[PDB]
Amino acid sequence: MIREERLLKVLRAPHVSEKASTAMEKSNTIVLKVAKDATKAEIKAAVQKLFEVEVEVVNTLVVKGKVRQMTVRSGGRVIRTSGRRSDWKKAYVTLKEGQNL
Amino acid sequence: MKRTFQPSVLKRNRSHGFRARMATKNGRQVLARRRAKGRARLTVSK
Amino acid sequence: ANGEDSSFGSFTFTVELFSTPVWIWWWPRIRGP
RNA sequence: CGAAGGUGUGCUGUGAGGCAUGCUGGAGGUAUCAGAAGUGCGAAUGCUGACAUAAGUAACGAUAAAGCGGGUGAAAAGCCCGCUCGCCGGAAGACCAAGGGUUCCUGUCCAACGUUAAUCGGGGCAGGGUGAGUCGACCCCUAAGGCGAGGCCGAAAGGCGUAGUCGAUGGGAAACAGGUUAAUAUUCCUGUACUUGGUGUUACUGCGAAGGGGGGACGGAGAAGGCUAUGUUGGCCGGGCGACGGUUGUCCCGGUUUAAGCGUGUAGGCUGGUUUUCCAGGCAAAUCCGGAAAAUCAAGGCUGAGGCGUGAUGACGAGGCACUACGGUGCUGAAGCAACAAAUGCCCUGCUUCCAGGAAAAGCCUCUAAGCAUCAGGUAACAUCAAAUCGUACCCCAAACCGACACAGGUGGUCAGGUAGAGAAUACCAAGGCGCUUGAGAGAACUCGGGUGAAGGAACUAGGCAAAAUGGUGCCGUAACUUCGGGAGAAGGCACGCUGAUAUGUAGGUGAAGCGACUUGCUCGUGGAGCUGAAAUCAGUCGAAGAUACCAGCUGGCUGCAACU
RNA sequence: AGGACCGAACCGACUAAUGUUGAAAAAUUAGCGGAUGACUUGUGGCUGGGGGUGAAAGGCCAAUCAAACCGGGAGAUAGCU
């Protein structure tokens, strides 16, 4: 069985978008950001425990980060820097009949 | 016309990859030289 | 109201220059053989 | 209260040079006499940076093509909307693999990038977007090959290789149809399914291998036959009655779709079946495989498209009825059949034939050994749970890949609609997608790509180079020579359109009802409705011309060389 | 039946023209040859430099080949410019 500390780790944030809002209002589906190494069983247990709702099924995907470019000044001189935003995991959690936040 | 570079990731890794460099002592010497130079990318492995 | 971008993530344009030697045929050019 | 450096002026020495001070500059510089040198530049097709010239010249990258109206805007040939025009259509459409890596969708901006402008963009910035038990990877299995405990070799490094372990481009389980987003869908939703495994309950029970045997499991070519995808026409349903003569009809336009699964098991293909006894074989043993006898029935079994039923009183559906921000959203919804023609797709890993004689291993089925014995295990039914992880956006014959470029090049797989046509050639079209990111004029020489030419017709030229010409199908006819196959489409001729009749559509193809049988339905025989449909002959008829376009052999004679592909 | 015939895909490359600071560091256009085979093609693998591979041309071995490329001996040597 999954320990409670793991469950308190795996849930990162609710994900806000019009796709997420439409999913909630159509299919009773909750979209979250989760830890990149969280399995579907872990997400199911975490939602069922920390949110006190009953979960039907979890769908997950990994989002690759984009390249972001911005400048940093280093000793009276602006230099252009480039780097990639970190990947993250998105969970589509379908609720049986409960209401969430 | 067909040009010389005809990419293929599998062939690239099997020829010049990290595990291919580590398999022989000459390839291990290639890696040591690149570490001594301070190369940001040791191999084609990505 | 619109604001100012002030980014120009393509402002610095790196410029180079390189060429290639060209084969020429000289055989009828010849005043000899 | 103005150093070095920069820039002028004056003076001065034979010269390298020196001194003074106006401006600029804003903090360093150094008499003299010695000392040390990275100590002096015009050249080295010297090296680096900057800037000229040609010159506002060549060019702006396929000759598929554009014209107007409206919109937005500072500004419109290029953006958006509309109407026309043109181009591709076995591709210039659609879907992928490889490769790429956010290029995808929305909002904003126009510096730079875009061979012009740009309000636009594969550009900048911000936000969003990739949902799987069944698709793919991972995973089980192995090929070529790689690595390789021990091992065998080798001055060292190391080489080869056994047990083994990796390695797909190959073999191993299972999902379809509708709907939906600005951007994902066999992944979400709706409906209807399926597979494998674990664990329990019940019932019946011999189970049990790194071992044996089956199976998986395999070439080329050719020829049917049976089908389907798909198409055409008719019927049906809905709509229409014509900007110019006619159009209530052998009239016009559109639609007539529906899957996995489950049930049935037929066109076809293969094979005799079932018992009993025995054993020098399958490294051991076996009830399995192989072999040998005997009896008795060949009337059994495997395999297999398609059709049919159900799935489905559901979904979809022309079009209407509404709202609207005129984007688009919402509601309802007719008919939804038949005949003919059909593949290169399926039956087919089949069948026939040939020689060059056509992977492996696992999953799977089966047999026992050691072993386990009222256990454990196996079989079936039911219940329940589990099917993780990674990929999924977008381009993908290309402006996202390989070519330094938004480059006339290269790049494997799949799908393939109509009319002509042998055809995947070719012409014109559909669905779909585009007009190729500089335009506007002019209408010189010359260059490029083409059209046509009096008379002549190879006189051209190294040479008929290039061009012109020939070109289809059927029939008649066809020499030398020959290795007897050839030569040969030798050469050379003739007939080709349309209309009517034979025959209101023929020969042929398909084939319904009706009827007869049977072993009684996915049956057989007969019958001929309906549909489709060449070719020929006779008669007529128009044009200069009937293989009318595109498409599509020039022919003959004598010789050298090499047999030939 | 066929290293059979005509001819698309596909694989080549005989002739001409254009192009030659190209649309292209070998192409385009019009013709041309093979097109069931000694064929062609995807994906992997193996052979390494006096070595490989070669239906043989000193062909090809990353736009490089009578001895690849990279680094080193190395500031080789240069009675020559």
Place this chain on the structure above:
RNA sequence: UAAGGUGAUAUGAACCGUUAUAACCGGCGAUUUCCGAAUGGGGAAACCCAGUGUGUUUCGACACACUAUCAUUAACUGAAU
């Protein structure tokens, strides 16, 4: 050692501290993902797949430890014989 701090970018925000347990500096500890000799097997570095124990369990499962090769030594057992 301290009246200032929360590294640069850095402004800001929300805060910490002012004799002494804010920050900073030094000694000693703790934690120390994954890859890499990489060592449980494999592999195209940063990934895929396990076996055996111990413990836990809400029966879904979960946590931890160990498991490379070679050399030497020891114990056990043990072919042709």
